[PDB]
Design goal:
Assembly: monomeric
Distance between the termini: 29 Å
PDB class: hydrolase
Name: Carboxylesterase
Strand content: 15-25%
Radius of gyration: 16 Å
CATH superfamily: Alpha/Beta hydrolase fold, catalytic domain
Keywords: alpha/beta hydrolase fold super-family, hydrolase
Number of domains: 1
CATH architecture: 3-Layer(aba) Sandwich
Entry title: Crystal Structure Analysis of the Carboxylesterase PA3859 from Pseudomonas aeruginosa PAO1- orthorhombic crystal form
CATH class: Alpha Beta
Length: 214
């Protein structure tokens, strides 16, 4: 399926938001529309993860950005599929730049599995530094090989997590934040008394963070 696209009048920025394991591209549409109120000239692109087999679940096929081989180590993933997903994101970024949107005004966002993809895209693969990353209830298994040059250190990041998350451990979420911090990246952290989900308070905080950068 193609990406859901929420255009904006005279769009001068773009947010590419990825859903989590097994979800649908429409999952974050209400979130995107809420944020468009905050950012009236920002376009939102919500891609759909392809349906593939997910080992850790019994091999069943469902929307997945990359195969997860075990519950532990979190690092046990199919990195080739992860890179294919990262390439799908890079293709969307390339398209927006070709349309005139500055790279500095393209921000990636992801919830859980989708968050691991955007963190990987921005900090391990895409050469041109982006305007920022939103990482919700997620983790970054490939940050074990994080090796930033000065230009990528300029990418701001906001990490969000439910302190009661029973799917992605808040500690794995903090570990991604800590790895970037250790490498000179400007990072923010906000947790909430909730589980593996999204809350309106969380969306208000994200809007304020974005308003400061767009």
């Amino acid at each position: 399926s193609e990406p859901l696209i929420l255009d904006a009048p005279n769009a001068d920025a773009c947010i590419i938001w990825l859903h989590g394991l097994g979800a649908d591209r429409t999952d974050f549409k209400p979130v995107a529309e809420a944020l468009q109120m905050v950012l009236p000239s920002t376009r939102f692109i919500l891609p759909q993860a392809p349906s593939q087999a997910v080992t850790v679940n019994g091999g069943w096929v469902m929307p997945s950005w990359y195969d997860i081989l075990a519950f532990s180590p979190a690092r046990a993933i199919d990195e080739d599929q992860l890179n294919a997903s990262a390439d799908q994101v890079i293709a969307l970024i390339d398209e927006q730049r070709a349309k005139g949107i500055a790279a500095e005004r393209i921000i990636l966002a992801g919830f859980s599995q989708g968050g691991a993809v955007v963190l990987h895209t921005a900090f391990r693969r895409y050469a041109q530094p982006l305007g920022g990353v939103l990482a919700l209830s997620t983790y970054a298994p490939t940050f074990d090989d994080l090796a930033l040059d000065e230009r990528h250190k300029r990418i701001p990041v906001l990490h969000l997590h439910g302190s009661q998350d029973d799917v992605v451990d808040p500690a794995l979420g903090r570990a991604a934040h800590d790895a970037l911090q250790a490498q000179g990246v400007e990072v923010g952290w906000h947790d909430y008394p909730m589980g593996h989900e999204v809350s309106l308070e969380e969306i208000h905080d994200i809007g304020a963070w974005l308003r400061k950068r767009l």
